[PDB]
Amino acid sequence: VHDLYGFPIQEDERRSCDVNAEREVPLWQHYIEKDKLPSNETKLKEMIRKGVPPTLRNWVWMETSGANKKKAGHAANYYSIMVKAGEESQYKKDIETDSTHTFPDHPWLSSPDGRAALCRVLQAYSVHNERVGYVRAMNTIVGLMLVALNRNEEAAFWLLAALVEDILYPGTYSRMRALDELIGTKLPRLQQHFQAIDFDISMLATDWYLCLFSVSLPSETVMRTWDSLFYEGPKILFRVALAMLKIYEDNMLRVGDAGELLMRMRNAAATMHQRDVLMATAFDHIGS
Structure with a gap:
């Protein structure tokens, strides 16, 4: 099976994301029809956070970036x-x-x-x-x-x-400073756990950051991170990184070895098909 962009690759996760994208279509159609993004910056940020239609990413990315x-x-x-x-x-x-x-x-x-x-x-x-x-x-x-x-x-x-x-x-x-702080503040169980097993988050998140998730997440999930990256800027990187750790926290806490945790999280990240939940979690403000 392949994804939208042709990469070979839960099936319900992807169906949910596609159906939610379909809901936004008439809103985005209005704008490309008028060949102008929304004047309201609050509204534009909200729309982009919910996902740019794939076919419009050239239009939107090239302008907002x-x-x-x-x-x-x-x-x-x-x-x-x-x-x-x-x-x-x-x-x-x-x-x-x-x-x-x-x-x-x-x-x-x-x-x-x-x-x-x-x-x-x-x-x-x-x-x-x-x-x-x-x-x-x-x-x-x-x-x-x-x-x-x-x-x-x-x-x-x-x-x-x-x-x-x-x-x-x-x-x-x-x-990386930001992510370690956020782990300690938002995910205190995880921080204790990373300390106990001597896990260095930079072993996982370095590639996340440098490659902008492109070697880590399913391609359609990556593009949603990019939607907001190209509009809001690089804080998106640590917000999405923290969201990944929040989402798979339960999973990580049961792993008692640093190398093992790395492999298991890389596997988890590679099947992160719920792009709606990833972005919504990245912006949830829980812990603020």
Whole structure:
């Protein structure tokens, strides 16, 4: 069985999320029809928190992330100049090799055209922003961006720029405080438990953060995190991370070994299909 975006992958969880998405359709249709997002920022934040329709993610993400504004502030041939320039990126080979073990099973991303597209975007970005260059985390991010953006490489390039340059803090990709605090405040049983087994949350959440959940969660669940990330900013990362720990807390407390807990939570995270409950839990304000 595959998900919406074609990744092979509870069935009730996904049906519930699809039916709830269907409820929002007439509201979103009104806006794309008028070719304008809601003026009311409170209303817009609420809508985005409930999930952008997949078919509108290019429309909404590219605007709320600021990628449209960045694109428009460069010449129209800019991406193509960067693609050509990236042909001699210092990172070309690393980018290529990092693709021999990412997306093994996606039918298009594992195709020659999909590999080439992903490489073009990353090599382009690596010369555009030489200070950042390329890091492995960006491979699966751009891969999911390509799939969510209907294989639009230039869109993916400008969304990646918005993310790295404007949304994430500077230095994110150069050579957790919040989450550990939140665990101690909101999940005191879990904190005692992590201390007792000497579990370092950064072993789990490092990839969560650097890869923006893209190697951790089912793709449709990831995109809901991205919906709010591209509108509200990077606090979404620790809010969703805490929500994951809240949701699987009962599960973790019965595991008496740090390595075991890591494997079990990675398995749990990989089948987190209830994207509605994940986001609603991330924003619930329980404990405030």
